[PDB]
């Protein structure tokens with residue numbers, strides 16, 4: 117093709133599919149891929165995030181700096197994996213106190229990790245390392261890898277997390293992967309999972325799924341992707357703050373990640389991997405990624421049959437969760 121990502125992905129396809137038959141690694145090449153500055157038309161005028169994405173696309177072998185290797189010592193029913201950034205201490209603590217608390221009702225173990233990269237001083241971030249170490253020692257729920265935690269590296273955050281599931285939590289029944297600014301009704305999710313047949317549970321992947329979306333071409337927008345980077349439509353994908361899937365599918369997704377080049381939008385990348393497995397993510401009405409009706413925001417009964425709501429502040433998560441604990445008496 118003409119777009120850089122599509123062209124390189126087609127090269128990967130030929131490498132993994134003999135039926136298409138008629139030098140540097142794409143997985144552990146971690147020097148700058150200087151060839152991109154000549155083959156990508158207008159490279160020098162792209163925003164810095166695109167330059168860095170294209171230069172280091174072929175590197176994904178990053179190591180854990182903070183690990184919790186025994187997080188799944190007891191086999192989880194539901195692993196909560198929450199994407200976060202170093203300075204988001206209040207968001208993480210609110211989640212710990214509310215919908216993300218670990219629990220074991222009915223022997224269905226719920227365990228929690230936060231997913232971080234580095235916020236390094238050479239990028240002008242304040243040094244919060246001692247505070248992060250303090251939080252990690254106390255709460256034992258931080259996983260942190262040695263890559264730059266940026267918007268366009270979130271598909272790295274996804275691949276490295278899936279790698280961690282395969283190495284350190286391969287027996288979890290289900291995975292919820294979400295953002296640290298959503299409210300999640302964990303009780304409703306557990307009730308939903310216990311209503312699933314084994315057949316439906318095996319390849320479960322639900323969220324707020326969008327079909328036939330394409331890249332935004334408006335250069336001002338957060339999710340802007342230039343025509344020189346990607347052409348065509350996006351596969352169906354769950355986006356908007358969280359999605360829910362089986363541990364069995366987590367392992368299959370991890371295996372397939374080597375065959376898909378990283379993409380600047382993490383939720384599109386996950387949709388690409390699901391597509392390569394031959395699966396279609398399923399839309400579920402309980403994922404409210406653009407909130408609920410203004411007058412309903414005040415009523416706790418509005419939250420009882422929801423799976424998640426985007427977005428809520430730390431104080432709102434705790435207030436909602438607390439009211440929810442007695443919602444069966446009022447709704």
Ligand SMILES: *[C@@H]1O[C@H](CO[C@@H]2O[C@@H](C)[C@@H](O)[C@@H](O)[C@@H]2O)[C@@H](O[C@@H]2O[C@H](CO)[C@@H](O[C@@H]3O[C@H](CO[C@H]4O[C@H](CO)[C@@H](O)[C@H](O)[C@@H]4O)[C@@H](O)[C@H](O[C@H]4O[C@H](CO)[C@@H](O)[C@H](O)[C@@H]4O)[C@@H]3O)[C@H](O)[C@H]2NC(C)=O)[C@H](O)[C@H]1NC(C)=O
Nearest residue numbers: 188189190191192193218219220221222223224225226310
């Ligand atoms: C959830 O998992 C539970 C186990 O996990 C632990 O507990 C939970 C609550 C969490 O805290 C988790 O973190 C823990 O890891 C599980 O609990 C277990 O359930 C079984 C079955 O009910 C219990 O077995 C009973 O054991 C007692 C003690 O037996 C010993 O002493 C007698 C001497 O009297 C000897 O004969 C025995 O060989 C043992 O050496 C038995 O008295 C009892 O026997 C009766 O029931 C059986 C089964 O019908 C009959 O065959 C007998 O004839 C008796 O009528 C049970 O065998 C076990 O104690 C219990 N563990 C704990 C730690 O409580 C729980 O069932 C899971 N499910 C739910 C919904 O919680």
Ligand SMILES: *[C@@H]1O[C@H](CO)[C@@H](O[C@@H]2O[C@H](CO)[C@@H](O[C@@H]3O[C@H](CO[C@H]4O[C@H](CO)[C@@H](O)[C@H](O)[C@@H]4O)[C@@H](O)[C@H](O[C@H]4O[C@H](CO)[C@@H](O)[C@H](O)[C@@H]4O)[C@@H]3O)[C@H](O)[C@H]2NC(C)=O)[C@H](O)[C@H]1NC(C)=O
Nearest residue numbers: 146147148165168169172175238262263264265266268269
């Ligand atoms: C996703 O996350 C990954 C992993 O963290 C990021 O990859 C790193 O990206 C940074 C840039 O942000 C890379 O650092 C840069 O490397 C350049 C190349 O270094 C090589 O070449 C020079 C010269 O030949 C050698 O001296 C050097 O030792 C290496 O062999 C450097 O030229 C850059 O230098 C510039 O910045 C530094 C520090 O700010 C200054 O001192 C310099 O003067 C100059 O201004 C810079 O160091 C880093 O190598 C990447 N790491 C890995 C493991 O690949 C991605 O950027 C990130 N992606 C997105 C989209 O955010």
Ligand SMILES: *[C@@H]1O[C@H](CO)[C@@H](O[C@@H]2O[C@H](CO)[C@@H](O)[C@H](O)[C@H]2NC(C)=O)[C@H](O)[C@H]1NC(C)=O
Nearest residue numbers: 141143144145146147148175176177178179262
């Ligand atoms: C990923 O693995 C590769 C391959 O082992 C590592 O590449 C070496 O590491 C650095 C990065 O360029 C250099 O010192 C070596 O010359 C690299 N080349 C080779 C051939 O090994 C790479 O470092 C790893 N990436 C990370 C982030 O750990």
Ligand SMILES: O=c1ccn([C@@H]2O[C@H](COP(=O)(O)OP(=O)(O)O)[C@@H](O)[C@H]2O)c(=O)[nH]1
Nearest residue numbers: 199200201204265266267294295296297356
């Ligand atoms: O560099 C980043 C930026 C975002 N996030 C996390 O990813 C989620 C998505 O971020 P954001 O809410 O800004 O995206 P949006 O909802 O606006 O699409 C948030 O929970 C952040 O904590 C991250 O982990 N690293």
Ligand SMILES: [Cl-]
Nearest residue numbers: 204205206207
């Ligand atoms: Cl915060």
Ligand SMILES: [Mg+2]
Nearest residue numbers: 295297426427
């Ligand atoms: Mg958000």
